[PDB]
RNA sequence: CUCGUAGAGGGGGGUAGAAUUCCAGGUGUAGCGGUGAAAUGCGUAGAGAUCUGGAGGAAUACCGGUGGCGAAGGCGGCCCCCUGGACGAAGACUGACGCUCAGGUGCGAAAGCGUGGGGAGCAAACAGGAUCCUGGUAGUCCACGCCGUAAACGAUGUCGACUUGGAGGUUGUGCCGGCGUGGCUUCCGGAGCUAACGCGUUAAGUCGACCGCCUGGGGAGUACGGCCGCAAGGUUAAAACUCAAAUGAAUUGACGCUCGUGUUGUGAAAUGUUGGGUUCCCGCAACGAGCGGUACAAACCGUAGGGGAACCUGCGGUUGG
């Protein structure tokens, strides 16, 4: 539950999280 | 951040055009890159600084030694009205202060009731343009209204960033402010005028019937010949003074 | 095909806290994962299953 | 004063302070203590050691009740979550169960913008 | 005229009049040329989370094939009835007559 | 959309026989029936711009068929618009 | 046209749960808050903390996925009403009814405006405390109207046909998990193409139809005029003058050492001398020989605001980080 408070403590711009999700998706390809 | 270009400094001093017999005071000489070219044309030159080592260096300067009068105290809390009567003449100021604290100091000088002959300062191009620009334009703002009510603003020269060291990412401009001998539109209280300007320009895209709704009604605005369907940026300085006088009278 | 009224089947796809287990863990197909999730949501509304364990 | 001998311990472990409150089953407070009230300030207040002595102060405050068993419920993500639990266990109070009560929104309210440092 | 699955729970203290409620709701079904396919009264159950300081509710499962207007009348009186504290009307693709997993 | 019974009724009337469903008159009549029905829907819902896109497609398609029918045989074209109360 | 399938497709009305804030009461009594450290602020009129009750607005954790849907912008709790599109199976039916479109019309993130409500959180501006923090107005929300702009991007117009192949997701369906047959979608890659990068059956391959648009950089998408708008501005759109470059992609360097030949690349160049282990060994497009973020040579886009402006902040978007 500590991993979600780190995400919900401060607001993140929706375009910011979208790019990180794309970066994570291309990172798992190896 | 300092200034290194010589011809820019030469243009500034020529633009100021100092003479003898009248009092001039420089705020924050620092390294005195600008105090040197002006210390030769004045018999008694006053400076206000907050550094001890730099003041000692200026006191021992061969050319700037006898011509200098150092004040080691804060300029914002400084009382500029005493020096005007001390020299029996309106003061002339050429600050070239950092842009962070230059704006509050200019309003501090405006509060001594035209005791200063002239005020030369270095500011950003955007800040300078706001002071000069008239209504019905983006540059026009509440800074403009409080600026041209006291003094007259005249741009002198735009300073490219390359002149300063290190060169910043924004332009610069030197401007001279001439306080009005007689107020073209005198007001009874500038606190009321400041309250109106900060009220209208807080919402400067809405019609003034909405931005000034808590202070003025539709009939009151029409009673002063002001169209309530105009934006805040469309209201001249005279009308702002007119509203400020009306509000003080009626409240 | 899945039924929101089958509490026994639904609890296999929820955690102790009540969160829905992802399809990648159970390996269920995409179509049934949507059906399971929607069925659990209906079950939560009818107070058959809790939203969380902190009620 | 009154004898209860059984209560539940609430810990609020933020990133700046840790608060330990002893309450009964009904939820009525019996005695509280904070890390900041023990002379710890600034960085020291945000240390796990500050919460460690804060729990001992709370145990001293509630020693009149003679409580044996208590329940620890962790609220807040800041450090000092474990330190208070150890102090309560080391103070003689019997540990019954440990649960997490951190409020998690279901995409309810917009959070404050992250500070840029 | 479509098939609708309707679930609603009754206040536990009013469970004695649940059969009376069933008939009136069914009467509007038969009166509107609707066929009630299956009904399963679950009685009292245990609620996952308390609602209005209640830990048990009288669940009633009713499967109805009826037009929209009678259903709208049925759902409106559910909101205006204090006996029921929770309701759910769900449109189904096909009529089903089978024992529920709850029974 | 349109009901199967309603579609079957229109096919029987305008079409020569039940199997005939692609005839120009049948398609225009089916399009006109759906267009007129949606008029009450869109009068209530002015914010449904996504469904209005589908409605415009029916109107545009109906115009093309009427132009094609008129270009081919004017007699059945006039006999149809008068029957359908169009133009 | 019939049957069926999946879907945050659209509009309208309900309802649920968590969380935030505030209010009332009880327990409880000195801090809370915040920062690198502080202070303003909040607090003996009783905070923070805890339990219960109520009010209010906004948003829907998990599921959730290089998943799905939509023409695009966009679209995530559950339920009902209305409604659009797509796809599959097997037929029936019409018989070119088609494709593309200047003007035109509608749609169109965020911001902004008009009228009237709403306002929890967040928060331009503003006010105060510091060398970011506290407080907080517009705004974000709703009804209706306007604005018509984005790095509105796949920086790839729409429609059709043809052309080697692999792996995966997602929805159909046929036959006996296998076996084919569809639609959309992701990655890799051949020929081919391209300045290179790279694209590569979803083309940037091979052709056809039509529309839009460009021909140096700056001045400038600026001035004037028209049109539109309440305004902000939008759209259409120059010239004088100035510079001889501006720009794209890739390469070599910065922030033990070379040659010969061969090989890769249009090329600059690389390979050798890129790796593993220990000068040496082995692998190896090399084989042998002679020797000892840069704008250099976070950024940006649209919009709005600034009185502690050497630039900064709010909202949404882009990777050209
Ligand atoms: Mg601007
Ligand atoms: Mg919330
Ligand atoms: Mg179905
Ligand atoms: Mg939907
Ligand atoms: Mg609505
Ligand atoms: Mg103070
Ligand atoms: Mg105070
Ligand atoms: Mg309320
Ligand atoms: Mg996720
Ligand atoms: Mg998500
Ligand atoms: Mg699609
Ligand atoms: Mg549908
Ligand atoms: Mg449909
Ligand atoms: Mg025929
Ligand atoms: Mg024939
Ligand atoms: Mg056009
Ligand atoms: Mg719209
Ligand atoms: Mg519109
Ligand atoms: Mg808006
Ligand atoms: Mg508005
Ligand atoms: Mg308003
Ligand atoms: Mg507000
Ligand atoms: Mg103060
Ligand atoms: Mg702030
Ligand atoms: Mg407020
Ligand atoms: Mg705030
Ligand atoms: Mg304010
Ligand atoms: Mg308002
Ligand atoms: Mg328009
Ligand atoms: Mg554009
Ligand atoms: Mg994109
Ligand atoms: Mg473009
Ligand atoms: Mg093609
Ligand atoms: Mg490829
Ligand atoms: Mg090309
Ligand atoms: Mg040119
Ligand atoms: Mg223009
Ligand atoms: Mg006009
Ligand atoms: Mg006009
Ligand atoms: Mg114009
Ligand atoms: Mg124009
Ligand atoms: Mg190459
Ligand atoms: Mg070659
Ligand atoms: Mg090539
Ligand atoms: Mg870079
Ligand atoms: Mg900008
Ligand atoms: Mg941004
Ligand atoms: Mg986009
Ligand atoms: Mg470019």
Structural domain boundaries in chain E: 1-92
Q: Which nucleotides of G are covered by protein (CB under 7 A)?
A: 1-3, 5-12, 14-20, 26-38, 48-53, 57-67, 70-73, 77-85, 92-98, 106-108, 112-115, 120-127, 132-133, 137-138, 144-145, 169-172, 187, 230-233, 304-311, 313-319, 321
What distance in Å separates the CA atoms of residue B170 and residue E43, rounded to the nearest whole number? Answer: 77
Q: What is the whole-number distance in angstroms between the Cα of residue B138 and the centre of ligand 46?
A: 15
Measured between CB atoms, which of E47, E48, E101 is closest to C3? E101
Q: E100 to chain C nearest CA, in Å?
A: 7
Q: How was this structure determined?
A: cryo-EM
Contacts of B82 (CB under 8 A, 6+ apart): none
Q: Which of D17, D47, D49, D46 is nearest to D34 (CA)?
A: D17
Q: Which residues surround ligand 3, an ion (CB under 5 A)?
A: E 93
* Burial classification of residue B36, based on how many CB atoms lie within 10 Å of its CB (0-12 exposed, 13-18 middle, 19 or more buried): middle
DSSP chain C: ---TT-HHHHHTTB-SSSPBPPHHHH---HHHHHHHHHHHHHHHHTTSS-S-S--
* Containing structural domain, residue F73: 1-87
List the A29 CA – G278 C1' distance (angstroms): 35
Q: Which nucleotide is nearest to F66 (CA to C1')?
A: G97
DSSP structural state of residue D88: H
Residue nearest to nucleotide G62 (CA to C1'): C19
- Taken as a whole, chain E contains a residue count of 103
Provide the 8-state DSSP code for E80: T
Domain that holds residue D115: 1-117
Ligand nearest to the CA of F54: 13
Q: Which residues of C touch E48 (CB under 8 A)?
A: 44, 47-50, 55
Could you write out the DSSP letters of every residue in chain B? Answer: -EE--HHHHHHHHHHH---SSS-EEEE--TT-TTHHHHSSS-SSEEEEES-HHHHHHHHT-TTTSTTEEEEES-SSS--HHHHHHHTTS-EEEE----HHHHHHHHHHHHTTSS-EEEEEEEE-HHHHHHHH--SSSSS--HHHHHHHHHEEEEEEEEEPGGGEES--SS-EEEEEEEE-SS-SS--S-HHHHHHHHHHHGGG-SSBHHHHTTTT--HHHHHHTT--TTSBGGGS-HHHHHHHHHHHHHH-
R_g (Cα) of chain F, nearest Å: 14
C49: exposed, middle or buried (Cβ count in 10 Å: 0-12, 13-18, 19+)? buried
Q: How far is C-alpha B89 from the chain's CA centre? A: 20
């Amino acid at each position: 539950v500590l991993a979600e408070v780190r995400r919900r403590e401060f607001y993140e711009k929706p375009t910011t999280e979208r790019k990180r999700a794309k970066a994570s998706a291309v990172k798992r390809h190896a | 951040n300092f200034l290194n270009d010589q011809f820019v400094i030469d243009s500034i001093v020529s633009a100021i055009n100092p003479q003898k017999g009248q009092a001039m005071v420089e705020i924050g000489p620092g390294l005195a890159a600008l105090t040197e070219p002006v210390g030769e044309r004045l018999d008694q030159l006053t400076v206000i600084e907050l550094d001890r080592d730099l003041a000692a260096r200026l006191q021992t300067h061969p050319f700037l030694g006898p011509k200098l009068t150092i004040y080691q105290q804060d300029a914002m809390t400084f009382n500029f009205g005493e020096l005007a009567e001390k020299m029996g003449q309106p003061l002339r100021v050429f600050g070239n202060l950092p842009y962070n604290i230059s704006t509050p100091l200019m309003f501090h000088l405006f509060s001594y009731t035209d005791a200063i002959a002239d005020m030369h300062f270095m500011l950003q191009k955007e800040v300078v343009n706001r002071l000069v620009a008239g209504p019905n334009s983006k540059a026009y703002g509440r800074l403009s209204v409080m600026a041209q009510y006291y003094c007259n603003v005249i741009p002198v020269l735009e300073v490219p960033p390359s002149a300063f060291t290190p060169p910043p990412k924004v332009d610069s401009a030197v401007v001279r402010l001439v306080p009005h001998a007689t107020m073209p539109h005198p007001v009874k209280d500038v606190r009321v005028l400041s309250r109106i300007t900060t009220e209208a320009f807080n919402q400067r895209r809405k019609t003034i019937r909405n931005s000034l709704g808590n202070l003025f009604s539709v009939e009151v605005l029409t009673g002063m010949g002001i169209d309530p369907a105009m934006r805040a940026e469309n209201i001249s300085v005279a009308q702002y003074c007119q509203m400020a006088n009306y509000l003080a009278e009626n409240a | 095909e899945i039924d929101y009224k089958d509490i026994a089947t639904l609890k296999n796809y929820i955690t102790e806290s009540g969160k829905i287990v992802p399809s990648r863990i159970t390996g269920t197909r995409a179509k049934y994962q949507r059906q399971l999730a929607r069925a659990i949501k209906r079950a939560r509304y009818l107070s058959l299953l809790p939203y969380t364990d902190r009620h | 004063r009154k004898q209860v001998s059984d209560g539940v311990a609430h810990i609020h472990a933020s990133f700046n302070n840790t608060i330990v409150t002893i309450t009964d089953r009904q939820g009525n407070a019996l005695g509280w203590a904070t890390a900041g009230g023990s002379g710890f300030r600034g960085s020291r207040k945000s240390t796990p050691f500050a919460a460690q002595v804060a729990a001992e102060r709370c145990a001293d405050a509630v020693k009149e009740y003679g409580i044996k068993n208590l329940e620890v419920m962790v609220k807040g993500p800041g450090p000092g979550r474990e330190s208070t639990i150890r102090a309560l266990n080391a103070a003689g109070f019997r540990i019954t169960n440990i649960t997490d009560v951190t409020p998690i929104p279901h995409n309810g309210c917009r959070p404050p913008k992250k500070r840029r440092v | 005229m479509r098939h609708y699955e309707i679930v609603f729970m009754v206040h536990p203290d009013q469970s004695e009049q649940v059969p009376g409620m069933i008939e009136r709701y069914t009467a509007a079904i038969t009166g509107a040329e609707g066929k009630i396919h299956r009904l399963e009264d679950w009685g009292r159950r245990q609620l996952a989370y308390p609602i209005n300081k209640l830990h048990k509710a009288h669940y009633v499962l009713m499967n109805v094939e009826a037009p929209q207007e009678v259903i709208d009348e049925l759902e409106t009186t559910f909101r205006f009835n204090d006996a029921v504290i929770r309701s759910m009307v769900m449109r189904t693709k096909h009529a089903v007559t089978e024992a529920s997993p709850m029974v | 959309s349109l009901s199967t019974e309603a579609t079957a009724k229109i096919v029987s009337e305008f079409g020569r026989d039940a199997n005939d469903t692609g005839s120009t008159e049948v398609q225009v009549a089916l399009l006109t029936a759906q267009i007129n029905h949606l008029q009450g829907h869109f009068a209530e819902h002015k914010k449904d711009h996504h469904s209005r896109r589908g409605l415009l497609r029916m109107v545009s398609q109906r115009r093309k068929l009427l132009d094609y029918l008129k270009r081919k045989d004017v007699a059945r074209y006039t006999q149809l618009i008068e029957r359908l109360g169009l133009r």
